[PDB]
Amino acid sequence: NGYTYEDYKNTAEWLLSHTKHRPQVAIICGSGLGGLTDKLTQAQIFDYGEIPNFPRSTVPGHAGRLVFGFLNGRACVMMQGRFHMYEGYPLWKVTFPVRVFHLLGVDTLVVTNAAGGLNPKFEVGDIMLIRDHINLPGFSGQNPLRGPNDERFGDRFPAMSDAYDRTMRQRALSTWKQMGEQRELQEGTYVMVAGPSFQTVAECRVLQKLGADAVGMSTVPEVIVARHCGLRVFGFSLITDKVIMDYESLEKANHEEVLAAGKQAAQKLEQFVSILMASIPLP
Amino acid sequence: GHMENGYTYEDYKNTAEWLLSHTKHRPQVAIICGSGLGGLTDKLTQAQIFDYGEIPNFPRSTGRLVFGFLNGRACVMMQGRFHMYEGYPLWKVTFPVRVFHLLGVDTLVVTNAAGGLNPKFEVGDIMLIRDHINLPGFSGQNPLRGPNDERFGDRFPAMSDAYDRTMRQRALSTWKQMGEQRELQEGTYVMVAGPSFQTVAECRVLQKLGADAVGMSTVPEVIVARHCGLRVFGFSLITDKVIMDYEAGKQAAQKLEQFVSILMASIPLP
Amino acid sequence: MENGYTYEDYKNTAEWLLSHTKHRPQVAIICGSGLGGLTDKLTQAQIFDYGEIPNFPRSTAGRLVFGFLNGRACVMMQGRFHMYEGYPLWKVTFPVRVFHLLGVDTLVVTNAAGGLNPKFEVGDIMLIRDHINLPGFSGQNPLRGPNDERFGDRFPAMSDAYDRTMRQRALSTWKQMGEQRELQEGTYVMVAGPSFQTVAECRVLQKLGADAVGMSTVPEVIVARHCGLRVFGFSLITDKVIMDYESVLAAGKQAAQKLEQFVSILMASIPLP
Ligand SMILES: Nc1nc(F)nc2nc[nH]c12
Ligand SMILES: Nc1nc(F)nc2nc[nH]c12
Ligand SMILES: Nc1nc(F)nc2nc[nH]c12
Numbered sequence A: 001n002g003y004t005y006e007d008y009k010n011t012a013e014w015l016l017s018h019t020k021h022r023p024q025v026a027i028i029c030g031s032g033l034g035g036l037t038d039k040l041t042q043a044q045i046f047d048y049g050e051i052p053n054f055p056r057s058t059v060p061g062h063a064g065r066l067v068f069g070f071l072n073g074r075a076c077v078m079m080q081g082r083f084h085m086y087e088g089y090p091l092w093k094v095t096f097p098v099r100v101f102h103l104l105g106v107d108t109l110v111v112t113n114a115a116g117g118l119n120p121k122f123e124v125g126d127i128m129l130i131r132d133h134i135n136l137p138g139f140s141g142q143n144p145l146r147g148p149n150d151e152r153f154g155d156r157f158p159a160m161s162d163a164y165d166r167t168m169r170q171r172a173l174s175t176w177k178q179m180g181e182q183r184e185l186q187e188g189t190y191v192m193v194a195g196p197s198f199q200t201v202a203e204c205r206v207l208q209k210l211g212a213d214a215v216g217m218s219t220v221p222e223v224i225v226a227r228h229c230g231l232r233v234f235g236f237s238l239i240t241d242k243v244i245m246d247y248e249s250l251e252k253a254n255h256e257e258v259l260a261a262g263k264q265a266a267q268k269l270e271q272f273v274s275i276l277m278a279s280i281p282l283p
Numbered sequence B: 001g002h003m004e005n006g007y008t009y010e011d012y013k014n015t016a017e018w019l020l021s022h023t024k025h026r027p028q029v030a031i032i033c034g035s036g037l038g039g040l041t042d043k044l045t046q047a048q049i050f051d052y053g054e055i056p057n058f059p060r061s062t063g064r065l066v067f068g069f070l071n072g073r074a075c076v077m078m079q080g081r082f083h084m085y086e087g088y089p090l091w092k093v094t095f096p097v098r099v100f101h102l103l104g105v106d107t108l109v110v111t112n113a114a115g116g117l118n119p120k121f122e123v124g125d126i127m128l129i130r131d132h133i134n135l136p137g138f139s140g141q142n143p144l145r146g147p148n149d150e151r152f153g154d155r156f157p158a159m160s161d162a163y164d165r166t167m168r169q170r171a172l173s174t175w176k177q178m179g180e181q182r183e184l185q186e187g188t189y190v191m192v193a194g195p196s197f198q199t200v201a202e203c204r205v206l207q208k209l210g211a212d213a214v215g216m217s218t219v220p221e222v223i224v225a226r227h228c229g230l231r232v233f234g235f236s237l238i239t240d241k242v243i244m245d246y247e248a249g250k251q252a253a254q255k256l257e258q259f260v261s262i263l264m265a266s267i268p269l270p
Numbered sequence C: 001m002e003n004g005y006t007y008e009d010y011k012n013t014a015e016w017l018l019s020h021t022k023h024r025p026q027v028a029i030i031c032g033s034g035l036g037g038l039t040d041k042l043t044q045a046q047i048f049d050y051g052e053i054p055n056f057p058r059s060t061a062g063r064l065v066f067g068f069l070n071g072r073a074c075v076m077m078q079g080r081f082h083m084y085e086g087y088p089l090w091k092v093t094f095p096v097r098v099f100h101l102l103g104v105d106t107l108v109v110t111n112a113a114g115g116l117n118p119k120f121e122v123g124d125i126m127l128i129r130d131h132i133n134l135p136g137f138s139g140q141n142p143l144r145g146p147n148d149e150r151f152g153d154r155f156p157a158m159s160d161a162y163d164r165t166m167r168q169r170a171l172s173t174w175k176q177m178g179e180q181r182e183l184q185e186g187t188y189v190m191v192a193g194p195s196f197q198t199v200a201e202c203r204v205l206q207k208l209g210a211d212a213v214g215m216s217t218v219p220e221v222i223v224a225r226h227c228g229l230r231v232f233g234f235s236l237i238t239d240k241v242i243m244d245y246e247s248v249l250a251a252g253k254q255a256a257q258k259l260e261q262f263v264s265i266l267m268a269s270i271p272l273p
Helices: A005-018 A034-039 A096-104 A166-178 A201-209 A220-228 A256-279 B009-022 B038-043 B095-103 B135-139 B165-176 B200-208 B219-228 B249-266 C007-018 C036-041 C094-102 C134-138 C164-177 C199-207 C218-226 C251-269
Strands: A025-029 A041-047 A065-071 A074-080 A108-117 A127-135 A186-192 A214-216 A232-242 B029-033 B045-051 B064-070 B073-079 B107-116 B126-134 B185-191 B213-215 B231-241 C027-030 C043-049 C063-069 C072-078 C106-115 C125-133 C184-190 C212-214 C230-240
Touching: A005 A096, A025 A034, A034 A065, A034 A074, A034 A256, A065 A256, A074 A096, A096 A220, A108 A220, A108 A256, A127 A166, A127 A220, A127 A256, A127 B200, A166 A232, A166 A256, A186 A220, A186 A232, A201 C125, A214 A232, A220 A232, A232 A256, B009 B095, B029 B038, B029 B095, B038 B064, B038 B073, B038 B249, B064 B249, B073 B095, B073 B249, B095 B219, B107 B219, B107 B249, B126 B135, B126 B165, B126 B219, B126 B249, B126 C199, B135 B185, B135 B219, B135 C134, B165 B231, B165 B249, B185 B219, B213 B231, B219 B231, B231 B249, C007 C094, C027 C094, C036 C063, C036 C072, C036 C251, C072 C094, C072 C251, C094 C218, C106 C218, C106 C251, C125 C134, C125 C164, C125 C218, C125 C251, C134 C184, C134 C218, C164 C230, C164 C251, C184 C218, C184 C230, C212 C230, C218 C230, C230 C251
Parallel strands: A025 A074, A025 A108, A108 A232, A127 A186, A186 A214, B029 B073, B029 B107, B107 B231, B126 B185, B185 B213, C027 C072, C027 C106, C106 C230, C125 C184, C184 C212
Antiparallel strands: A041 A065, A065 A074, A108 A214, A127 A232, B045 B064, B064 B073, B107 B213, B126 B231, C043 C063, C063 C072, C106 C212, C125 C230
């Protein structure tokens, strides 16, 4: 909605004429993972406010930025600060950047996010390779593809069964081994809820019964739009808290030093994404 | 902003009265043709066509109404339905059903093309719709949202008896005596908003929820119809099997079209 | 603001109310359908129609009543707003924010629900222990949009929505009441409505672990918790939801009355600053 094809094109063209960079891979940084932009080399920064047609920031803190550069050698463009539905953005604004990435000539999207753990076996700071998703907003009509289809992007009714690239998953699992980590790289299903409130125990139990392994309030729309455009997609959730799944466990004690360990866990995810650039196929 | 109804009662009545004075036909039955089943209109006798663009207040397509007799029965047939995924609000989607009621229709037949969730189902099957699951409805996308007009129905219409019991018995028995190679399957249709297809994980929740087939239509129309007091029955043509783990059609539509014709005889009189 | 109210708006309303009433309420009660008879038990009552009150959404019935109930200063809302009537949730929950800025610290919610737990009988009272916010899952959450920290957190916890202390005291007051039916306890699921559930829909609500279903309340509770209001509430079971294909107005007036009297009794058991 709201944007014409020309808008997307005008934006891609503007970016293309104001940077010499030509990215192949786009990375969307989740909450706490913005430090990935510091890992880029020969970086060139664009504040959203400079970029024509880019949705204005409505939220506290600085407007986000698009950072171009190389990540372990690979030509990348990186979004720091994503738009969320819960902040009152429509989905067509949330996913505006993904369409622009396509027109930039990007062929791969990496998504990161911070998630609540639903699978009992997960621990705070685990990384979960996303194998699949459940789109709750989507079932009810909040789907970023709603409205007339543009065949210049893709098909009317795109398949999502193969959303998370199988080759990249095999290669993530295989690269993880060489890094010799304490814990295994987890694999499972991300469920999107609109938020912003956190789940009740009842709601946490439904989400488990539905087969979700991790929950958050982002990502899925970007992935749907990415696949519509024929982008290759892989992604990771950093598990930032275990979701409370019983009333007995409302005998709960908080330890505020869970935030130094979380900087370390974010850092591990940032460096794992970085290294995986070696394993993405070239165009 | 969601479900901001632009239609007054007067608008619905103006449309019904325009159609009533531009054709002598007086339908008892309205039939909504799903994707690939528009050829049902060729079966009508004594037909008159109205393009949607010609009829007042009717939503514009991106479409026609055909009146006629189907196997002797006074019908109105909708060829080219509106879908939520195209960006139509549900009050535009179900506008035709309001109009049909004011035309005099007492029965709605809904047909659609669906994905198979029940593993028993095969491509080309016909599923008699026993019940539904309205996922959009749970969250707010219900075509009855807004002030209720008692001229149409109650504030809180019951939906447990949505798919007429008698018609389900007569469809099961009429099929039996057609002696078909395939059994007439029966189950729950789940509506999702669309337009993207299900992931393996979403296909599995839909199965867990007890749905046998999935699609992106029909349910709003059924709800509006029951609000109005219409008898309802319907069928899904199974066009694909939904992928549920991590690993021709023209003829089958024709079989449905012909089964719908035959079943006109089983519908009670007004 | 577009699609909402600013802090200034809610404050303007609360200040207006506060300079047009003598009452300073501690407890707010939002009455469900058929349960508004409590308002006639308020002493030193003072009544405002919604159209009287700045920024208040106009019902399309509906009033606000301040007074004392069983020794406690209350504000009572008769004729709540529902999503199915076409109201956005930021209108539905507008009064809860006003109540907070009035100085209320406790919200009592009642509603009329369909029974999904097979054990529940028509006329039963269910103490709400938890909820499932179906519309919340998909976008319809009253906190959607810009957040003001004068009300609460960006990502508020709802694990503890239904106050544990009141829950125990309700159970305890019921035991001493001598009532013959047990006081039921379970999860309320909100559906947007207005159409009632199919058999298939009822069965998913059951599999999801919900004990009773209705079309209200959850939004008010979320906004209340976001505000730090203490919350407890009750569902009167008005019908058993048809759960299989097998397929009274005066008994429900008595059952409603019983709920009204239970809320009035419990005024005495709410903590007091
Ligand atoms: N990290 C998280 N934890 C809980 F409990 N609920 C959530 N909903 C979205 N994200 C969440
Ligand atoms: N035929 C279909 N297949 C899948 F997977 N999803 C759908 N959603 C609606 N129709 C559908
Ligand atoms: N009381 C009720 N009964 C049924 F059947 N469905 C409902 N949906 C909301 N309330 C309901």
